[model samples]
Target chain A: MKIKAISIDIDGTITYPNRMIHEKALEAIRRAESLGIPIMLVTGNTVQFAEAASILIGTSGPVVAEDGGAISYKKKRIFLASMDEEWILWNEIRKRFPNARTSYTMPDRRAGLVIMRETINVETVREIINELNLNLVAVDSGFAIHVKKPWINKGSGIEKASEFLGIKPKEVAHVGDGENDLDAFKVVGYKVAVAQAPKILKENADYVTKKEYGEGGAEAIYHILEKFGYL
Target chain B: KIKAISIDIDGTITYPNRMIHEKALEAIRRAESLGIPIMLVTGNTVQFAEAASILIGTSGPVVAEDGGAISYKKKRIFLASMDEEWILWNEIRKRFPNARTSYTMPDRRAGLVIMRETINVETVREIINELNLNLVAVDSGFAIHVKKPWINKGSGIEKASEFLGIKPKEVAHVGDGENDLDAFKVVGYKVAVAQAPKILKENADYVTKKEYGEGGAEAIYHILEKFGYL
Candidate 1:
């Protein structure tokens, strides 16, 4: 197996309800750092949220935030890609639907776009964009709606992280349990779906866990390491 | 008494209400000074756990997901001995044919257990038990867990203790809920939080007056100091 580096998603992949951090998980991370494994947190969370998580997780490594819009290590930018085009469209869309509230993607990349109001004008946005022929996709991350660039997502983030780390896609292992994580699954050498992930992800993943996220992510890494005889 | 100590990050070390705690930092340093192995056991994946480890500056082994995965001293050692998602989904499809299932894949490490408006925690548990599966329940904010039963703190500590070449009875276990019961049983010294559930409190060999956050570790620290480990 011999993995040189690893990338993980945040939100459902790391943080859970009632608890922002998982305990046993910290130990696994500590070990990786001691072993000098470059651990990168590739997520959809904002830079601010990722910073908070970085402090909690204790890693200062590069963080791929907002799906791939931004990358930073030790609080410094290393790589950045943005949904600037989508942002411009969103500003115009706001004028058309003034009542609609929107939230931008975070650095960690998971919390997605959070919309505060109920019943979004998805049809209206679609129509306006269709009429204008804008190139943005509206994604619903449960809490809010997102007007995202077509090429931006966790997959792009992983690719960026891998390139920055100088590791091949095959030498990297990605563990996630979300629809957004699909792109990551496509690029990594070993794909692991946590037990609590959606069925589609489990079916697509190379390995499935007996444990859900938090725990499941750990289990997957352990098995992969063991398979490579790192144990 | 023990060769190592494996701690959980969220509720155990860091205050669940906020962020990191100084007591946790102190405890980690104390353990390191004594050359005692300090590990973290949680339900988070390796990368996620590594993030925390880098923050706390305690690069140690982590037994995540009860016991589903074991990363010894930072290198992964064991993982996914069971396949819980396949088992659960197959049962769900057969049992509730019409129920709409919302599927999500978070990274590639964990599976989803969503059903539009709600997740049937009880039903999930029943199915896992009925099928004789080896998964445990992790209470994520919105759903129930169907993960490896062996990936919990108790199992994690046991594995860590063995890895460090120490007896379980020589280790001191600290936690705040029923999930921590296994750790209490396996370790020699058991410390429970004051805010711990009645069952956890009753089973504790030592009870901390402080609630969660770093208070629990503080209690453990004082106990170890009393025993001359400090």
Candidate 2:
């Protein structure tokens, strides 16, 4: 069972509070890259966030950002698939809901737009969407409002990434810690849950880390590789 | 116009533990009357999907286990019992050393449970996220699925189309789940039931005004009518 590639989720999985990646985790990633194992950063965050983390970790296989909606390596756009055409309707939504804060990242031609409201309650978001019959997704990414076209999530991103890398879904190792991260868990071969992950995530995890995020995520990757004889 | 139609079993034709609606039944009869072939495409195993077909009153081949195994036109196209069983058992014992594996014995299918009952659906979902498996939960049963990554209803529909010598762009696929989302990649007109999830409905080219077990089939009929397919 040799580990070929390792995919790490940013946010809670790779970066802890104070926006810092664990020093030990960084070393582990560098070591993995030095060993010729391709390291991919898969995250629900935007490409900018993943790029920052990639620079800190020091590996450049590919970065799967916005869950799996966008993929890139060395800042070159590899693959981008959006949710649906109805996603463009969000621009109309922005006009109607003036208070809604929106952000768009069109990383690739085929990829869908990543839209979010700065500060809106989930209930309100759902209510407004129901009332207006809008095609918006109110994903719970903590405080932020994540609105994307339908069928666009981390899982779809993983599928696209796997296709781009010419790797089978059963061959990749995926790690993350959040509800948005669940799609990735469903798609990968070896799933790892960080120590600070939700209880539900811990329960589904192949292995739970003792350390928290940042350092914890790095350790989880190390142990997973070791378990698969990569160490 | 296509000669045969391969309908997804769950959510498309009937909900869990529910009977097909009268209107939907009428649509099936109309398709039959028009001599259009109808098949049942599902993520369920042959035994389970066959039982569902009986309940839904449609007699077609069931593409089970998300195309991991298929029973095409009542004949077995692919069977992965040995391979699935061996891979699942070995992987659970080896890679998932700490997690308890739950096996789904679907009457006569080679489905293995990847998560225990104690495992929360969210947790199971997380594993799906991390592992990037092409599997979906059957309800909140906390059962982790393992289907071929390309083995989805969309691809299954394409396979059925090719077998029948029909063009994919001419087919109309109606579904209502996250797994059903890929149908758009294969078919031209994507119809979603009114009862579909927000994500699913949003991707649909059109949504039925009726819910599942209601007049959803009529909704499709009307869309076809508008397209002058009727």
Candidate 3:
């Protein structure tokens, strides 16, 4: 009944939309560590934000960012997605909305454009995607509006992270509150959603928490730990 | 001044929050039938802009996301113009961590769309007072809007006029909110609804006898009659 690893989403899971991590999530992560279970961040945040978030959350493992577009461990960086395609798409998007806001952590490798705030808006994103007719898709992650590639996602990153940890996909549990987490859910043993997530994600979750956002994240951890008799 | 009608979306056209005003829709259809191009300027997200543009049935350009984008025909063409609102919005979110805000369509929005349990419009104004970021507030009866001082339906009207190759003096602007005041400042012909605040009514070149959606109809009739198209 022992889970070998855990993969968590940064926004709307361990952290709130206001860019602050939930204290209970931090505590739960540390407890998971104390129990010899590896906890890692598989996020849609930028590499810069992910690295910093990993440190703040007291994660001992490597971080995955840009929805698995880039992976960094022990200071070694690997580009899993094509930055060249992203640059072209950026040009097209910027042209679509001359004043549209891009991700602040754009300096890092990118797989898609995540609306970090009310910087651009939704109708414009939809119009752009429809016009471009690329393999791109859009979803509100509760924290941001993400325009991401349909193929490579956080699930693929979780799979990569599992291999790095010498663990199997069935041994890892994932929790999140956005459509972007759909990929991660497919690659983990237990798929969990916070209370605030959309109805579709919650209905499909292995366990849906009573609390939304960060509180649900802590609760999901408790459920897992209790299942293994570790709590 | 009847070349193109640039209208405000919130109180002027759409009323009672997200629902469209029936009378306003009827008047807009009349304007379309007359072959007068129309454009929608809004402080809501661009997603609403696209939907509203299609709803209004106009082929003119749309100024949305508060003024961040300009699109024609619900977007055969779109151009984004700014990101200043996000900076102030972030600061506000950071200061009031518990504040209620929606992140939907984040990339395509203009002004800050804030909702309250009881619609406390002044709370945001008070916070802006504290921050003093040269921002202004617009109450559209459904949501509280926070944006830059210069962003208004007027600026968007100006963009539409340019896209249509019409001069500012050739445009007639209609609206019913505080932000619409800026549009009045940009256009030569200003039509303010009877329900408008004293400040807006006093500044308008022509005031409608009706209120809300009906007032939009009143303004449209007035324009067509004056321009010999009625």
Candidate 4:
């Protein structure tokens, strides 16, 4: 019956399909902040991108960036995973497929490796991972293919971020629109999925918003605020 | 006349409203096809600059965090200590209670960015003088920067150029704000967009007729024409 904070996905959750921020999300976030509930930005993007987005969106809470690889709370950084194994895996993949390339910002990653999906697809990466007998998993985040450890995810990040905020993971509500968000959905008490989310996510979610993308994000926030009496 | 290109983002590559201009993409590809390596020199993070560079098909390193950081190959160079910038930011925050750092503060390595409209750049400069700190402030149109006086986009370009074995005078720099003035001073061919301030346009060898991202495309085409690539 009590939700103290909110965790939101950035890419397909708050942004339109083309990566533009929806105007509705701006107002909804402002309203939540006005009600004294902090909003944390959780993203599989780079830490710099996540920090900049949180700043631009005027979110007062911390950030979970690079999936669960990087976490920032009260200015203290908590790193959960290492990219050493993933980097080796990428080089191995590149050795198998000469045209395979890591994402441009891959050099800045601390935990995970993202291979661009332009030339190589996720199925190809999954096969290579299986062939190599590597202890890694490949996830398609739509924009890119993420090569990471099984334990490193939004759920682990939210758990650590919650520890820093002195709140239980059950007290946080997570809104997302992708397969990667499934991890956070497992840990958070209240799970919300937008219409655009995959069927698996919607099936596991506690609530599904009618709207899609940022509009769905706004709708989910409204639901949280109303249910928690913050509205 | 230039061997390399350095460009700005924000008001330069994006529209006044921050949407990327459609025309700039093809123009950038055309430039890259002609063996010209382009680098994104921006006040944004290196990750941001690197992402844009990769998407735009640039073949060179990037300078970001308002010249505080440079990413070349697999290595990154930071101009100053993070502690130094953090301390200076605290002082500024204390002096002007309304002064707040930009949301990108955590990503900044050498420079501290203050959100625009919260405090005047003049007062921040005066505070630096009063404190006798070896720092300078520039109102970069999007935000105000507090950093060491010698650290700027020019310095970033200089380092990046040396890495690529290209001299400063052999590079063409394009931008549309006050922080861009530092870059204009060092490059051989300077281009200012139509929306640039008077001082920036005054420092340019060419000013594009179109503003914002179209201005960026025009600058690229003009450069190609200058070297007979078009």
Best by lDDT: 4
Q: Provide per-model DockQ scores.
A: 0.06, 0.01, 0.01, 0.12
Each candidate: how many clashes? Answer: 85, 27, 15, 0
| Residue B210 shift from truth in candidate 3, angstroms | 71
Give the higher-lDDT candidate: 1 or 3. 3
TM-score, candidate 4, is 0.62
Q: What is the lDDT of residue A212 in candidate 4?
A: 95
Residues A1-231, model 1: lDDT tens digits = 357766776655554532344454555655665666666776655554465576576654567777665666653554344445555565776777777765422322432343433646566666666777887666555444655667776777677777767778677777787776777888777788878788888888888878876677667667666665566
TM-score, candidate 2, is: 0.45
Distance from true location, Cα of A21 in model 4, Å: 1.5
- Tell me the lDDT of model 1 at B96: 77
Tell me the fnat of candidate 2. Answer: 0.00
Segments in model 1 whose C-alpha atoms lie over 4 Å from true places: A104-124, B1-230
Tens digit of lDDT per residue, candidate 4, span A1-231? 578999999777776675655557766887898899889889888876666566445687789999988987654577898766676677777778899888766656788888888879999888877877778888988788888888889999999988888888899999999888899999998999999999999999989999999899999999999988888
User: B-chain TM-score, every candidate?
Assistant: 0.78, 0.73, 0.81, 0.93
Model 4 ranges off by over 4 Å? B1-44, B48-63, B67-230
For each candidate, what is the lDDT?
A: 0.63, 0.61, 0.69, 0.82
Which candidate wins on DockQ?
4
**On a 0 to 100 scale, what is the lDDT of residue A49 in model 1?**
48
In order, what fnat does every candidate score? 0.13, 0.00, 0.00, 0.11
What TM-score fits each model?
Answer: 0.49, 0.45, 0.47, 0.62
Candidate 1 lDDT by residue in tens digits, B64-162: 545555655435544454356776768877887764433222321343334533546677777878987766555544335465544556766777667
